[PDB]
Design a protein around this nucleic acid. Structure first.
Ligand SMILES: O=C1Nc2ccc(Cl)cc2[C@@](C#CC2CC2)(C(F)(F)F)O1
Ligand SMILES: [Ca+2]
Lengths: 400, 543
RNA sequence: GAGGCCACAAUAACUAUAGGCAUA
DNA sequence: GTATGCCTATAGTTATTGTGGCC
């Protein structure tokens, strides 16, 4: 086995377990029993003081998720600087990419003995009527970032035969997932995937349809005092993202204490300012470029009526990417879907996961995010109050 | 034979080397007498100069330094069960192991750290040195290691006896069954004989306690649970320490006694105060303290959990950001009760705090019963869909239904979405100085009217609300207001029914009386008409 | 050798992120 | 121009007091 360590000053994960419903506790005892028979995990004593949360997911029966967000952090030099998997820039340019689970490809590989204690997790019991069942991994765990890093070697050697017979196709691996980059058509794509599923059994997204979209301002016959006041507040705010935006000639029109309903004729100087503000928005933004050394950030706003706006950026107001998502459904189900859609988008494009700013209370999210989660990764997230001008501004994007 | 759990000190640390102070002669005779017994039974061993370590005698000996040097463990009392969670049983007994630690061996390599000395009377002469062979009292690792031993000692018995429920809790076993008492008593004795194979003693039938069992401050019957009776003293002078323990007893009551409120007494404890400061009760505390004192005359009890039925949670508003709930399965037979009080003071409207209360109860239901309840809330299903579709944050509740028990939960006013044709347009502003804490509020109207008052001892935030207070006060039933204060505009869209500031629910009364109000925001300092004029008036003497 | 340990609550104090206002 | 100064959020954290316990 490959020796793994931590940073020399780091301690092991000591994360508390969020409480679980009885339906999921029963499902987890089943799953971990069979994993104990098959040698994959082992019960441990109380002399092991580390813990890592464990959850249950449906993902198209049940499934065990281990939230290793804290352990990955404490081994990040190991799986990033040392054995890291480099990113294919050509992946996002494929006309179509589909996603493959290769989770079961880790269970064969043994795990370094001195490192298994850091991987401890605790099935809890209802009402604390029972001590809590404590396993630890004996093999490479699904969801630890060291796992594909270590399986890296044996993954090149298991695909070179396919990749030699298709050196056009690009395929990239983040965690327990494979990404198949192709330009072939829908028929000659799905045939290729079910071939590769048989090449591996031996041992539905299109990034081009994603497009940053332009802001569109109202188009009005009769502008009113109120209409303009609303519009300069929005434009004044968006001059932080488009600095070539001005409101000088629109405020000249609001001279003296006018009633809110009064109609204002657009002077030619105003009508010009407006017409180029429009042109600055209908074209891209500039000076914004991806930085490999900084964290991606993703912020979602609730728009109402089952639709949502997001932005991926690295410094305030410099959005690498923005978009919209819309809908027997509730906010949490929708929010959970956006977070997964935004993440896989962010995965193919940059090979990284964004840290989310979520417009929900932490307690509520901790309760229900597990209901509709289907991914093997879980991203970093935090809980924010969306300011009103941010909601108002990104409403005005256009729809595909 | 119970195998030892391997234990290590924390990386870099060495074992304790604390000095033994000399002790009274009457103290020494008592130590040598019980130390020679523990030696006779193999619990401790005499040692010699080969051992560099030592801990001082006290719980026989005090292991402060050693516990600081011992590795961490995954601690076993993560949380206490709650009585509501337990299922009704027919026959329950409690066994207490009495040679608990004495019967678990200590990892061989760790024993050298437990060394301790009985000093000599003359003290010129050296003393007797000993070390532990079994889990010592007061050692950080004893509880978790004992619990791990007990858990595997009971696993054969548990598999052989599926219907019996053994709950381990420190040195105690709590055993329940639906067997009838005779056949219960037979199983209890097989369990005693099992524990006895590994040398664990337990009270025989003649010595076992009868229901009810006192546990963790609860009184546990086989069919119901209660708390031990709650005394709160009657004084005329009240020190801050006294109000601390008042709030403590009430908070402990609120799990079974419904409708307890403490937020009035907690408000007395805000800010620093030496514990003997004789604080006089605000009188609306005595109101709440009266209501609470009589609620505790009532008899109460909780029932146990029937898994085959649904859980129901019903919430009532007690007012002033105070709420109370009950959980039951069959009507008027409560499992437990609780309270929820926002006390951030943050401006939050009742619809939101309500949603917060349900989120606390959902979390607690999953801890205690492993499933979420069905809710009965004093809020209309359209009033809720009104708020939570206009609100910026997401939420989600499980099944809930309206229930009509006043006071209900309504949105006190409704601001217009578009500007009101034919309504006077007010342009408001405030301004204050930090240095002189002095400021002005005012407005300017499209119909020619204007007004400026000077306030004293304010902040910029306060003056911007005062100016809105003036426009609403000097205007008709339909107004358009424009402010430049994102603060004032925000604190009014969210509609805080309660508050600590008089000025803000003052304003909320004004908005209640009004028929149509439209509230708009423009950015400050941009030459926008109306705002410019009023900003000139308000900031004249101020900046 | 001036009790530690757990759950909950209250009070106080300080870290980050975002937002606001103000002033130089 | 670029920095500090004061408030509000969403979170995290260390300390005290208290209720109920235990050793
Ligand atoms: O599930 C049940 N039902 C129940 C009813 C009454 C009593 Cl008094 C005790 C129980 C029991 C327990 C317990 C711990 C809180 C001590 C028992 F383990 F069976 F003792 O657990
Ligand atoms: Ca102002």
């Amino acid at each position: 086995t490959v020796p793994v360590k931590l940073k020399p000053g780091m301690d092991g994960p000591k994360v508390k377990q969020w409480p679980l419903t009885e339906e999921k506790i029963k499902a987890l005892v089943e799953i971990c029993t069979e994993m104990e028979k098959e040698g994959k995990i082992s019960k441990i004593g109380p002399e092991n003081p580390y813990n890592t949360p464990v959850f249950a997911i449906k993902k198209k029966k049940w499934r065990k998720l281990v939230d290793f967000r804290e352990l990955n952090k404490k081994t990040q030099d190991f799986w990033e600087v040392q054995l890291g998997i480099p990113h294919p820039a050509g992946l996002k340019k494929k006309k179509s990419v589909t996603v493959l689970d290769v989770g079961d490809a880790y269970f064969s590989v043994p795990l370094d003995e001195d490192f298994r204690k850091y991987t401890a997790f605790t099935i809890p019991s209802i009402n604390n009527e029972t001590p809590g069942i404590r396993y630890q991994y004996n093999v490479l765990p699904q969801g630890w970032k060291g796992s594909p890093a270590i399986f890296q070697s044996s993954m090149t050697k298991i695909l070179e035969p396919f990749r030699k017979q298709n050196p056009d196709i690009v395929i990239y691996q983040y965690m327990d997932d494979l990404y198949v980059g192709s330009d072939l058509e829908i028929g000659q794509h799905r045939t290729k995937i079910e071939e590769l599923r048989q090449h591996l059994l031996r041992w539905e997204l299109h990034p081009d349809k994603w497009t940053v979209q332009p802001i569109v301002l109202p188009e009005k016959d009769s502008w009113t005092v109120n209409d303009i006041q609303k519009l300069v507040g929005k434009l004044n705010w968006a001059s932080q993202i488009y600095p070539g935006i001005k409101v000088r000639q629109l405020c000249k029109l609001l001279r003296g204490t006018k009633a809110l309903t009064e109609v204002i004729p657009l002077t030619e100087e105003a009508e010009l300012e407006l017409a180029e503000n429009r042109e600055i928005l209908k074209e891209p933004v500039h000076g914004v470029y991806y930085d490999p050394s900084k964290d991606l950030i993703a912020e979602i706003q609730k728009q109402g009526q089952g639709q949502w706006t997001y932005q991926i950026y690295q410094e305030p107001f410099k959005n690498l990417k923005t978009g919209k998502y819309a809908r027997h459904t509730n906010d949490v189900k929708q929010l959970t879907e956006a977070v997964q859609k935004i993440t896989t988008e962010s995965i193919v494009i940059w090979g990284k996961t964004p840290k989310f700013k979520l417009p929900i209370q932490k307690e509520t999210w901790e309760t229900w995010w597990t209901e509709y989660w289907q991914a093997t990764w879980v991203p970093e997230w935090e809980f924010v109050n969306t300011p009103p001008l941010v909601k108002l501004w990104y409403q005005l994007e256009k729809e595909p | 034979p119970i195998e030892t759990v391997p234990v290590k000190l924390k990386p870099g640390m060495d074992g304790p080397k604390v000095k033994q102070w000399p002790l009274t002669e009457e103290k020494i005779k008592a130590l040598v007498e019980i130390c020679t017994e523990m030696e006779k039974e193999g619990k401790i061993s005499k040692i010699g100069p080969e051992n560099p370590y030592n801990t001082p005698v006290f719980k026989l000996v005090d292991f402060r330094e050693l516990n600081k040097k011992t590795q961490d463990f995954w601690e076993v009392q993560l949380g206490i069960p709650h009585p509501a969670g337990l299922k009704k049983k027919k026959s329950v007994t409690v066994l207490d192991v009495g040679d608990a630690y004495f019967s678990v061996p200590l990892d061989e390599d760790f024993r050298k750290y437990t060394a301790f000395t009985i000093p000599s009377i003359n003290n010129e002469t050296p003393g007797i040195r000993y070390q532990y062979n079994v889990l010592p009292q007061g050692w950080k690792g004893s509880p978790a290691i004992f619990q791990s031993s007990m858990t595997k000692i009971l696993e054969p018995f548990r598999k052989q006896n599926p219907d019996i429920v053994i709950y381990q809790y420190m040195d105690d076993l709590y055993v329940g069954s639906d067997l009838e008492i005779g056949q219960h008593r037979t199983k209890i004795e097989e369990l005693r004989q099992h524990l006895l194979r590994w040398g664990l003693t337990t009270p025989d039938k003649k010595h076992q306690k009868e229901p009810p069992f006192l546990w963790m401050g609860y009184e546990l019957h086989p069919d119901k649970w209660t708390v031990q009776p709650i005394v709160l003293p009657e004084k005329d002078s009240w020190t801050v320490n006294d109000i601390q323990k008042l709030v403590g007893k009430l908070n402990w009551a609120s799990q079974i006694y419904p409708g307890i409120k403490v937020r009035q007494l907690c408000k007395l404890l805000r800010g620093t105060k030496a514990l003997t400061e004789v604080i006089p009760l605000t009188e609306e505390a005595e109101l709440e303290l009266a209501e609470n004192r009589e609620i505790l005359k009532e008899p109460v009890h909780g029932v146990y959990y029937d898994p085959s039925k649904d859980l129901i949670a019903e919430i009532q508003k007690q007012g002033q950001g105070q709420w109370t709930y009950q959980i039951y399965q069959e009507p008027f037979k409560n499992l437990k009760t609780g309270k929820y009080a926002r006390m951030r003071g943050a401006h939050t409207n009742d619809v939101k705090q309500l949603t917060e209360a349900v989120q606390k109860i959902t979390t607690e239901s999953i801890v205690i019963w492993g499933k979420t309840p069905k809710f009965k809330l004093p809020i209309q299903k359209e009033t809720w869909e009104t708020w939570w579709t206009e609100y910026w944050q997401a939420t989600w509740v499980p099944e809930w239904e309206f229930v009509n028990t006043p006071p209900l939960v309504k949105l006190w006013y409704q601001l217009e979405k578009e500007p009101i044709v034919g309504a006077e347009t007010f342009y408001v502003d405030g301004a204050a100085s930090r240095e002189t804490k002095l400021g002005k509020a005012g407005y300017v109207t499209n119909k020619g009217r204007q007004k400026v008052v000077t306030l004293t001892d304010t902040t910029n935030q306060k003056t911007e609300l005062q100016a809105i207070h003036l426009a609403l006060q000097d205007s008709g039933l339909e107004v358009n207001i424009v402010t430049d204060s994102q603060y004032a505009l925000g604190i009014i869209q969210a509609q805080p029914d309660q508050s600590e500031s008089e000025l803000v629910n003052q304003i909320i009364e004004q908005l209640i009386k009004k028929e149509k109000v439209y509230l708009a925001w423009v950015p400050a300092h941009k030459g926008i008409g109306g705002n410019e004029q009023v900003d000139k008036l308000v900031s004249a003497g101020i900046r």
